[PDB]
Ligand SMILES: *[C@@H]1O[C@H](CO)[C@@H](O)[C@H](O)[C@H]1NC(C)=O
Ligand SMILES: [Ca+2]
Ligand SMILES: [Ca+2]
Ligand SMILES: [Ca+2]
Ligand SMILES: [Ca+2]
Ligand SMILES: [Ca+2]
Ligand SMILES: [Ca+2]
Ligand SMILES: [Ca+2]
Ligand SMILES: [Ca+2]
Ligand SMILES: [Ca+2]
Ligand SMILES: [Ca+2]
Ligand SMILES: [Ca+2]
C-alpha cells in the first residue's frame with residue numbers, strides 16, 4: 173500500500189498539551205458513522221494514555237512529555253468500526269520514534285581510580301587508565 | 312483502521328514473471344494525479360528489486376523466485392504523492408510471509424560416529440547414539 | 451491517505467472578517483520550525499488574496515465575501531518548509547465549494563413576445579409561448595425554478611378571462627369564448643415569473659396577441 | 663514532511679534553452695483548476711527571470727546559463743491557487759546549488775615582487791616569498 177510514515181517526536185517536549193500528531197480517515201464512511209479508536213503500549217496498554225484519538229475526527233495526539241531514555245519508540249494499531257458495530261478497515265500499524273536530547277550528564281566508571289609507576293622511568297611512559305559514560309545518543 | 316492482511320507467497324515459485332500480488336488505491340486522487348512508490352528491504356533496500364509497484368495503477372508484484380531459507384519474510388512501506396509533489400496518505404506498512412517447501416535434504420551431525428560395547432552383555436542394551444538435521448520447516 | 455474533506459462555504463457571507471476555515475499541522479516539526487504557505491487561484495494566483503494562511507499556526511482563512519455566481523469552486527495547494535529551507539511534506543491539495551444563495555431575480559427571454567390567433571376558434575387552443583430564467587441553482591434548490599402567471603389582459607372586454615398560462619411551461623391557451631376581430635382585434639396581457647415555484651421573487655413581461 | 667531535495671545545476675551550462683528541472687503537482691486539484699506560480703530572487707525578484715514555471719503543468723525551468731562566481735545558490739518559493747482565487751497549499755521552499763567549473767585563471771597577488779640577499783651566504787637559505795590566487799572552488 174500507500175502506508176503511513178513513522179512519526180518522529182522530540183524528547184522532553186514542552187508547551188501546551190495536547191499536540192496533534194496526525195489525522196486519519198476511513199473513506200468507507202459514506203455509509204454510516206465511523207468510530208476511531210487505537211491500541212497498544214502507550215495506548216491502552218502500559219504506559220496507558222500517552223496517546224489518544226478523537227473517535228469522531230480521527231486526530232492523534234501526544235498527551236504529555238516523553239524521555240527516550242525511558243522508551244525510545246512506540247508501535248500502535250488503529251481502528252475504525254461502524255455505528256452498527258462492524259469493523260470497516262483492516263487495522264493499521266503506527267510508529268513513533270523518540271529523538272534524543274542532551275538531558276544526560278556523564279559519569280565516571282568508578283568513583284576513584286588508582287595507579288602506580290617507578291621513579292626512574294622515562295618521559296612518554298603509559299601509567300593509568302580512566303573511564304566514564306553518558307547515556308544520551310552517541311551514534 | 313481497516314488494514315491490509317499479510318501476504319503469503321510460496322517459495323521456489325516458478326511461472327512467467329511478473330506476478331501481481333495486490334493493488335492499492337489512494338482515494339484522495341479526486342484532485343491530482345497520484346504517484347505510487349514503495350520502500351524497504353527487498354524494495355529499494357538490499358535485496359533491491361524483488362518487488363516493485365506500478366506508479367500509475369497501484370499494482371504490487373514479485374519479480375523473481377524466492378527461498379525462505381534465505382529470507383523468510385519481508386516488510387514494506389507504501390507511498391502516494393501528488394503531481395504537484397505533496398504526500399497525500401500517511402504511508403502504509405506491508406508484510407509478506409514465505410511458505411516453506413521441501414527443498415532441503417537432511418544431513419548427519421558428523422560424517423562418522425563411533426561406538427563400543429562389551430562382548431558378554433545382555434540383549435536390550437543401549438550402545439551408541441546418532442544425529443542429523445533438515446533445514447526446512449519442522450513446526 | 452487520510453485526506454482532507456472539501457470545504458463548503460456559503461455565498462455572500464457577512465460578519466467580521468477573518469474567518470478561520472481549518473488548521474493544518476506537519477508533524478515533522480520535531481526538528482525545526484516549519485513555515486506554512488499555500489498556492490493557487492484565489493491564493494497567490496488571480497483572484498489573489500481571498501484565502502491566506504498563518505505561516506506559524508497553520509490556520510486557513512477566508513478574507514472576504516464571495517459570489518458562487520462568479521466562481522463556484524476553488525482548489526488550492528498547501529506547503530510546509532523548514533527554517534533551513536527544505537520542504538518536509540509533499541504538498542496537499544485543498545478544495546472549497548461555494549453553496550448557492552437566492553441572490554438572483556429571474557429575467558424574461560425577450561423584452562416583449564408577440565402572438566396571434568383567429569377569432570372563430572374553440573376553447574382549449576394553444577396560442578403563444580413565453581420564456582425567462584434565473585441564474586441561481588436549480589438542481590438542488592428552487593432558487594432557480596420559475597412559475598409563470600398572468601395578471602392583466604387589456605380590453606378587459608367582452609370578459610376578462612380569455613386565456614390562461616401553464617405555470618410550469620409558460621404556454622398560453624384560449625380558455626374562454628367571444629373573440630371578434632371586428633370589435634376587439636388585439637390584446638395586451640401582463641405576465642410574471644417567480645422564484646421557488648412562484649414563492650420567491652417576481653418580474654414582468656408583456657405579450658401581445660393579434661386576432662386573425 | 664516528504665520535502666523536496668536541493669537541485670544541483672552546473673555552471674556555464676550550454677545547450678538548447680529551456681531546460682526542465684522538475685515538475686510539481688498539488689493534489690487538491692480534484693476540485694478546480696490550479697494555477698502554478700513561483701517567487702524569489704532569480705524569479706520575480708532581481709535577477710528576474712532566470713527560472714519560470716508553467717502555470718498549468720507545474721514544470722520548472724532554467725532559462726539561461728549561470729556563473730556560480732556571480733551567484734552560487736538560489737532559494738525559491740512555489741505557489742498554487744484555484745481559479746476561483748484561493749490558495750490551496752502552504753507555499754513550498756525550493757533550493758538550487760550551482761556547481762563550480764574551471765572557468766577561472768589564477769592571478770598573482772602583486773604585479774611584481776622584489777627581494778634581496780647577501781652575496782656570501784650558504785646554500786639552503788630562504789630569500790623571497792610570492793603570492794597568487796584562483797577564484798574557482800578549492801575545497
Ligand atoms: C393590446 O395592444 C393594443 C395596441 O397598442 C392596445 O391598444 C390595447 O390596449 C392592448 N390590450 C388589449 C387587450 O387590446
Ligand atoms: Ca531525558
Ligand atoms: Ca537524551
Ligand atoms: Ca549527554
Ligand atoms: Ca529453498
Ligand atoms: Ca524449504
Ligand atoms: Ca526437508
Ligand atoms: Ca451572488
Ligand atoms: Ca446564488
Ligand atoms: Ca433566484
Ligand atoms: Ca366576428
Ligand atoms: Ca564562471
Ligand SMILES: [Ca+2]
Pocket residue numbers: 673730731762763764765766797798799
Ligand atoms: Ca568556476
Ligand SMILES: [Ca+2]
Pocket residue numbers: 764765766767768796797798
Ligand atoms: Ca581555476
